[PDB]
Protein backbone atom coordinates (compact mmCIF):
# COMPACT_ATOMS: atom_id res chain seq x y z
CA UNK A 1 0.00 0.00 0.00
CA UNK A 2 1.60 3.21 -1.19
CA UNK A 3 -0.09 6.53 -1.83
CA UNK A 4 1.20 9.88 -3.05
CA UNK A 5 0.88 13.05 -1.00
CA UNK A 6 2.61 16.40 -0.64
CA UNK A 7 4.51 17.07 2.60
CA UNK A 8 3.43 20.44 4.06
CA UNK A 9 5.30 20.49 7.39
CA UNK A 10 4.91 19.36 10.98
CA UNK A 11 4.26 20.67 14.48
CA UNK A 12 5.10 19.19 17.86
CA UNK A 13 2.93 18.19 20.80
CA UNK A 14 4.70 18.41 24.17
CA UNK A 15 -8.95 16.00 21.88
CA UNK A 16 -6.76 14.26 19.22
CA UNK A 17 -9.09 15.40 16.46
CA UNK A 18 -8.76 18.92 17.79
CA UNK A 19 -4.97 18.58 18.16
CA UNK A 20 -5.12 17.56 14.49
CA UNK A 21 -7.20 20.55 13.54
CA UNK A 22 -4.68 22.75 15.34
CA UNK A 23 -1.84 20.99 13.54
CA UNK A 24 -3.60 21.62 10.23
CA UNK A 25 -4.13 25.31 10.88
CA UNK A 26 -0.61 25.95 12.26
CA UNK A 27 0.72 24.45 9.07
CA UNK A 28 -1.67 26.55 7.06
CA UNK A 29 -0.61 29.79 8.74
CA UNK A 30 3.06 29.12 7.99
CA UNK A 31 2.19 28.06 4.43
CA UNK A 32 0.09 31.22 3.99
CA UNK A 33 3.05 33.26 5.19
CA UNK A 34 5.79 31.64 3.09
CA UNK A 35 3.48 31.71 0.05
CA UNK A 36 2.19 34.48 -2.20
CA UNK A 37 4.95 21.23 -0.44
CA UNK A 38 7.33 18.49 -1.50
CA UNK A 39 6.32 15.38 -3.47
CA UNK A 40 6.29 12.24 -1.28
CA UNK A 41 5.12 8.61 -1.28
CA UNK A 42 3.52 7.20 1.89
CA UNK A 43 4.36 3.49 2.24
CA UNK A 44 1.77 1.81 4.52
CA UNK A 45 1.89 -1.51 6.33
CA UNK A 46 1.18 -3.28 9.62
CA UNK A 47 4.87 -2.89 10.52
CA UNK A 48 5.34 0.86 10.03
CA UNK A 49 4.64 4.00 7.95
CA UNK A 50 7.45 5.36 5.73
CA UNK A 51 7.58 8.68 3.89
CA UNK A 52 9.80 8.50 0.81
CA UNK A 53 10.83 11.38 -1.44
CA UNK A 54 8.67 10.90 -4.56
CA UNK A 55 11.81 11.53 -6.61
CA UNK A 56 14.82 10.11 -4.79
CA UNK A 57 12.66 7.42 -3.15
CA UNK A 58 14.86 8.20 -0.16
CA UNK A 59 13.50 7.65 3.36
CA UNK A 60 12.24 10.89 4.93
CA UNK A 61 10.26 9.42 7.85
CA UNK A 62 9.97 5.87 9.23
CA UNK A 63 7.62 5.23 12.08
CA UNK A 64 7.03 1.79 13.56
CA UNK A 65 3.20 1.71 13.84
CA UNK A 66 3.26 1.26 17.63
CA UNK A 67 4.84 4.70 17.97
CA UNK A 68 1.94 6.09 15.92
CA UNK A 69 -1.08 7.11 17.95
CA UNK A 70 -3.59 9.03 15.85
CA UNK A 71 -4.39 9.58 12.21
CA UNK A 72 -6.99 11.97 10.80
CA UNK A 73 -8.15 13.13 7.41
CA UNK A 74 -9.70 16.56 7.41
CA UNK A 75 -11.10 17.26 4.00
CA UNK A 76 -7.83 17.00 2.08
CA UNK A 77 -5.07 16.97 4.70
CA UNK A 78 -3.69 13.95 6.61
CA UNK A 79 -2.43 14.36 10.15
CA UNK A 80 -0.17 11.63 11.47
CA UNK A 81 0.60 11.82 15.17
CA UNK A 82 3.68 9.86 16.30
CA UNK A 83 5.78 10.00 19.50
CA UNK A 84 9.18 17.45 21.27
CA UNK A 85 7.56 14.28 22.67
CA UNK A 86 4.79 13.85 20.09
CA UNK A 87 5.10 14.96 16.44
CA UNK A 88 2.31 15.87 14.05
CA UNK A 89 2.96 15.37 10.34
CA UNK A 90 0.70 17.30 7.99
CA UNK A 91 0.39 16.04 4.43
CA UNK A 92 -1.97 17.07 1.65
CA UNK A 93 -3.51 14.55 -0.73
CA UNK A 94 -6.17 13.65 -3.25
CA UNK A 95 -6.48 10.24 -1.59
CA UNK A 96 -6.38 11.78 1.91
CA UNK A 97 -9.33 9.70 3.09
CA UNK A 98 -7.99 6.45 1.62
CA UNK A 99 -4.59 7.09 3.23
CA UNK A 100 -6.22 7.57 6.65
CA UNK A 101 -8.63 4.64 6.10
CA UNK A 102 -5.61 2.52 5.05
CA UNK A 103 -3.53 3.55 8.05
CA UNK A 104 -6.44 2.89 10.40
CA UNK A 105 -6.89 -0.55 8.84
CA UNK A 106 -3.18 -1.11 9.32
CA UNK A 107 -3.78 -0.21 12.98
CA UNK A 108 -6.57 -2.82 13.27
CA UNK A 109 -4.54 -5.66 11.79
CA UNK A 110 -1.35 -4.74 13.70
CA UNK A 111 -3.40 -4.71 16.89
CA UNK A 112 -4.90 -8.18 16.13
CA UNK A 113 -1.38 -9.47 15.65
CA UNK A 114 -0.25 -7.73 18.87
CA UNK A 115 -3.14 -9.34 20.78
CA UNK A 116 -2.41 -12.71 19.15
CA UNK A 117 1.22 -12.68 20.28
CA UNK A 118 0.16 -12.05 23.88
CA UNK A 119 -1.88 -15.24 24.14
CA UNK A 120 -5.11 -13.27 23.62
CA UNK A 121 -7.25 -14.55 20.78
CA UNK A 122 -8.13 -12.02 18.05
Amino acid sequence: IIFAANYLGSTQLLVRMMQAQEAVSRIKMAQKLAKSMTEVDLFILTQRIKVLNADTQETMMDHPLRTISYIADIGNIVVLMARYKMICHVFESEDAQLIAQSIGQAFSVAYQEFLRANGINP
Binding site: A20, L65, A72, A110, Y111
Partner: peptide, 13 residues
Protein backbone atom coordinates in the same frame (compact mmCIF):
# COMPACT_ATOMS: atom_id res chain seq x y z
CA UNK B 1 -13.91 15.20 10.09
CA UNK B 2 -12.32 11.70 10.20
CA UNK B 3 -9.99 10.47 12.95
CA UNK B 4 -8.55 7.07 14.02
CA UNK B 5 -6.70 5.93 17.12
CA UNK B 6 -4.13 3.14 17.40
CA UNK B 7 -5.25 0.74 20.14
CA UNK B 8 -1.73 -0.70 20.21
CA UNK B 9 0.01 2.60 21.08
CA UNK B 10 -1.11 2.50 24.77
CA UNK B 11 0.92 -0.65 25.30
CA UNK B 12 4.31 0.82 24.45
CA UNK B 13 3.52 4.40 25.50
Amino acid sequence: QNGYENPTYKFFE
